Amino acid sequence: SMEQVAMELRLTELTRLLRSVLDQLQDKDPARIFAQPVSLKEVPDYLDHIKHPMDFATMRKRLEAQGYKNLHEFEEDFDLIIDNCMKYNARDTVFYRAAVRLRDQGGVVLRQARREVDSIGLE
């Protein structure tokens, strides 16, 4: 149907905006602490601690398969990256501190992304 096509154009547009958001967020991680899944070879007990792992590579895979239906679902995954890290690692670690900085700097980006999604009506 034409309606289904229109929907898919909207999803494609959202995906384009979210790709830009994701790039901007990952720039705020120059250490690449959050670029890849935490390795279960180097951290074998990780899944005992964290029930829903997330990282930028995994987000990007879902993104390019148009797997985010709205900004909220994307934000959920971003929050998982930050929140998992702040649980697993202690406050005095480079990991925890990197998560705080990512959260603080990313909020700026996400604040405007929400306005843009609403404004352009991508949902």
Ligand SMILES: COc1cc2c(cc1OC)CN(C(C)=O)CC2
């Ligand atoms: C072995 O290598 C790494 C280990 C970890 C991280 C990053 C790494 O390399 C980039 C990040 N971490 C998080 C997000 O909890 C702690 C574990």
